Amino acid sequence: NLYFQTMYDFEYLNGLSYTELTNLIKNIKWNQINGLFNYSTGSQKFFGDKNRVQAIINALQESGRTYTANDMKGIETFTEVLRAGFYLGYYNDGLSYLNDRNFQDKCIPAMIAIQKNPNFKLGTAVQDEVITSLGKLIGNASANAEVVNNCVPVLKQFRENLNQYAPDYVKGTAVNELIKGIEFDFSGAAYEKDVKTMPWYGKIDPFINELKALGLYGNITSATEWASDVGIYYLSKFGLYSTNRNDIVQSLEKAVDMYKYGKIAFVAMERITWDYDGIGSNGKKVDHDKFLDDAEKHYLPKTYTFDNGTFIIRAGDKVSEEKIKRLYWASREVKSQFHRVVGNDKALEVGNADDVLTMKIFNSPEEYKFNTNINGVSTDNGGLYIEPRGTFYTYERTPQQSIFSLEELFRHEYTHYLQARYLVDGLWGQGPFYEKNRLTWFDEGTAEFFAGSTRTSGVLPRKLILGYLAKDKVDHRYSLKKTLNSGYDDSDWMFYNYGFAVAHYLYEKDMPTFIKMNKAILNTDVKSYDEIIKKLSDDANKNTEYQNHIQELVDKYQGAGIPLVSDDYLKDHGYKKASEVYSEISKAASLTNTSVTAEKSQYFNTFTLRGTYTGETSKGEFKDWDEMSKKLDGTLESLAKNSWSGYKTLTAYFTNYRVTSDNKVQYDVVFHGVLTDN
Ligand SMILES: [Zn+2]
């Protein structure tokens, strides 16, 4: 169509002679051809002239024959043009002839020429790019056993310089693209056919052996591990085209043993399971689950059992016993504050997995990654609680690996365990309160909030979250409306920090609403919850209140702290007669109709004392809550003035607010602490 111009349209290229065209292609870059990968009338007529594409194929072959270490003879730009051809032909009827294997094979003479060149080696940028381009072309075109086995020298060269070459992006990419391209083509052709019917079947043993050597290199480092990963993955794939099935499975099994509980061993097992029907070289079925089970025992060998086996920590061998204890005692501080605010400590459902809380704490982030392999959950996080398993997965960490210590993070995630067991009825995230966007701010916001639980001072803000709140006031602070009604669509990284601010704002400045809101969720009453959220969002004064609270929180940053369990918990408390502890607590807290259970843990025993507290005439539910909190914290503080160090392990909460027939405040009250009497 066109006969005048440095970007080039198909209408112009279509008008050139094949010799003027091929020459032009040879000394431009692929991106200079407009709409190369787009299907048009112009690209239709460019490809679809079988003579012109065969002209391009021929030019490529001549480049393969003549390229040097410093000059690529336009092999990249040629390969991309052909790739565009086979790509458009796969997707667009009218260029259907390009999708035909018999036509794709017309590139093999070009490929063989490229490989016969003395410069077909890893080395300089040109030589590497040729190998890269070749692999990408094979993925869209074709290969046969001859071209595949001609890659064996490259794979040898790479292997022989693995520590120099495997880390290099360019050389690593070259080899990866070569293997990946060939496999894509072969699996494409072998798709849904008897694999013994393929030409290359049995003819690629030299290539397969090069993958073997790569996969079983053994002396891998963090930098080179992917290379041997590649080796094993593709050993399995290409080994489908070997006559000795058991020989391949045997090498995959050696990978498993050689690499045991590193990445490559998981890959090797996957290959045996998927590519070889999970049947070992000895012909017997491989115990995949035992391997996973062994992997977990390796990574999490230590078990620490608390509360008659209802709080179990499985941990890496380097996670501190001291830490383990601190986490137990943290759990109790958060639990208690949560029950105070919610007013229920009876599990909503009978028989759920969370009847036992299991925590799995890997030694490190590195080792944490294997938890996706082992337990099938994401490890792109600092931790995760899976409610239907009643299991929290996380890992020990230094300050460099995370801003959050293990205790801080657990304190947050433990609240999710509390929400599912004690607050939100039904299955986690799959009830009325999730049929619309309702609890997104709440679930995360209150978790950040309850993480700041203390023993005797209620819930306190956490310095790090206040740190986040020191960011652009300018336009950036969420309004109350935005925080309450914002979801996964409308939000950025500060969402949960403003959700915490709403939680805290309500806690400190509007407890009546916080209690109402919590009751609404507890009672499974979406109507009332929605009304509270609408009232809050519609009242501009409440937003002015809230905007101020945000500044107040920000002002508290300088002097703020990380609520963390005291060292007092870890001291040697010494003996005290049980009935004396129960009497002093019962008297001090004015409890009636008390009962106690004792529970055995790894390093100590505990007790849980339950009673009824009937006070003076009610001053209203919310003022009652305020005063009961000060009375109960006062009781905890005065008990810790006693000589027995064990009184410093106490946590307490109250539930089931009611008024009596004579208007007297009433609660169920619960204390928990260490027990040092047989
Ligand atoms: Zn969370």
Residue numbers in the entry: 110 to 114, 117 to 789
Authors' description from the paper:
Clostridial collagenases are among the most efficient enzymes to degrade by far the most predominant protein in the biosphere. Clostridia employ collagenases for nutrition (e.g. saprophytic strains) and host colonization (1–3). They are large multidomain proteins of ∼115 kDa belonging to the gluzincin superfamily of metalloproteases.
The recently determined crystal structure of ColG revealed a saddle-shaped architecture with a distinct segmentation of the N-terminal collagenase unit. The collagenase unit is capable of degrading native collagen in the absence of the accessory domains within the C-terminally located collagen recruitment unit in vitro. Although all peptidases adopted an open conformation in the unliganded apo-form and a more compact conformation in the complexed state, this breathing movement was most pronounced in ColG and least pronounced in ColH. In the ColG crystal structures, this site remained unloaded because of the presence of at least 125 mm citrate in the crystallization buffer. As evidenced by the comparison of Ca2+-unloaded (ColG) and -loaded (ColH/T) crystal structures, the liganding glutamate side chain undergoes a marked rearrangement upon Ca2+ binding that allows Ca2+ coordination. The crystal structure analysis of ColG suggested that N-terminally extended substrates assist in their hydrolysis by employing additional interactions with the edge strand in ColG. This relation explains the need of ColG for N-terminally extended peptides to obtain full peptidolytic activity.
